[PDB]
């Protein structure tokens, strides 16, 4: 069966990640950020009441998912890579945004792309990688061969420290915001190599879920109207590094 | 519920678009591409008996589409853009392939962008738009406000007949497949402009599907493990014209 979201209140799961959920301090907690906007958009055509609650601090993008299957949320909307892993125990909607990732580094490193880390010129524990990302598992099947020898990170913020302290030489990071990040707030890091890992966003649902069409009829005219398109650019178009 | 596609019988629907699906004449028909080949991987993994089914001539792909709501496939694979009006009707597995759009022309057509379309440079009724497609959709939106002005088209061969003609003067045609066309078939009719429309491609399923999650999971594994870039790369990455 189906139904639509019109009154119906929804639990939305959301994940700190700049600029997609921007978190601020004052005590109390404020939110902005492509998602929030995304929220408000989808709430206006769908007339939903919106519920949103901000994923505890060390969560990580598996354990949002966890979490949504295990009933903590009705829905969780951010920068949420569509996974066959997760897809067994959660359904997604239609993309909000294609992705892909590239590889993170300290300006200057002598790292040509993808080749570097496959051919061994970086030991494996000079590789970062935060765990329950989708990177994770991209390096156990593309560079390791299912071993668990990266070095590990529990957040983006251990991810930049320990190249700026030079304890990795790489991570992985989803282009959207790292370049978001390496443009605006760190700008001794840069990007290097070509995209890999082309993939989707999409919001995280139930398994079977009743209101599946309503959601996907009003992302997909969000897209056709431009609304996607114009959130992106509003949020990701700055460049404040020299 | 949810289940597995083992030992079942699948309609699946296929729409001639080559190097997608190629129909061939022989002394009866075969079909070759990009379509039959992910066909083979998914059969071979998932263990359905495929009965592959060619759309008439001069079918449509919103045609394609509604003949799946009304019973006569049960999946349909091809170059099918996800929209809102289709997902008002059947749903969509998880996307097999970016897309956009671009701007098609017969060399020497002065025509530099969209903007002469939307400047009324060109006469609407030499604006040719098959219907049925989601380039049609995009036409009422951006170009026409809403109105059904444009030369319809029936089929690719239509719009093809039509350009070198001199019948029209422009139509709208999905980018790999127009990259093909303009590379290795008519190598007097071109593109240009900036790309527009970014959309996706799904694979076709009735709504509320028992196997939908073992479709997705599957797609996405293909995608991950690189056999949608493997299969993009054999079919698409090849130019005749000089
Ligand atoms: N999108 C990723 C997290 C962010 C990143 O890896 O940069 C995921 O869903 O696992
Ligand atoms: N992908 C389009 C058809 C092909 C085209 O417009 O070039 C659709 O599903 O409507
Ligand atoms: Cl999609
Ligand atoms: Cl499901
Ligand atoms: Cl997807
Ligand atoms: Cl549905």
Redesign the interface.
């Known amino acids: 069966?189906?139904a639509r979201l019109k009154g119906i209140t929804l639990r939305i799961g959301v994940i700190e990640s700049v600029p997609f959920t921007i978190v601020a301090n004052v005590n109390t907690t404020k939110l902005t950020g492509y998602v929030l906007d995304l929220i408000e958009y989808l709430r206006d055509k769908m007339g939903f009441v919106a519920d949103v609650q901000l994923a505890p601090p060390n969560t990580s993008y598996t354990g949002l998912v966890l979490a949504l299957a295990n009933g903590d949320y009705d829905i969780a909307i951010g920068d949420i890579t569509?996974?066959?892993a997760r897809?067994?125990i959660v359904?997604?909607s239609?993309?909000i945004s294609?992705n892909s990732m590239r590889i993170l580094m300290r300006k200057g490193t002598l790292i040509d792309g993808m080749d570097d880390l496959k051919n061994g010129k970086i030991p494996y524990n000079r590789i970062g990688i935060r765990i329950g990302t989708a990177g994770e598992?991209?390096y156990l099947?593309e560079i390791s061969g299912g071993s668990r020898n990266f070095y590990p990170l529990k957040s983006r913020q251990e991810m930049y420290d320990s190249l700026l302290a030079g304890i990795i030489d790489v991570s992985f990071m989803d282009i959207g915001t790292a370049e978001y990040v390496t443009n605006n707030i760190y700008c001794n890091l840069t990007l290097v190599g070509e995209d890999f890992?082309?993939?989707?966003f999409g919001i995280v649902t139930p398994?079977?879920w009743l209101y599946?069409?309503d959601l996907?009829?009003?992302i997909?005219?969000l897209?056709?109207?431009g609304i996607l398109?114009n959130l992106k650019k509003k949020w990701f178009q700055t460049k404040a590094c020299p």
């Open positions: 069966g189906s569509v996974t066959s897809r067994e359904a997604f239609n993309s294609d598992d991209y099947r890992d082309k993939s989707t398994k079977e599946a069409k996907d009829v009003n997909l005219s897209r056709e109207t398109d």
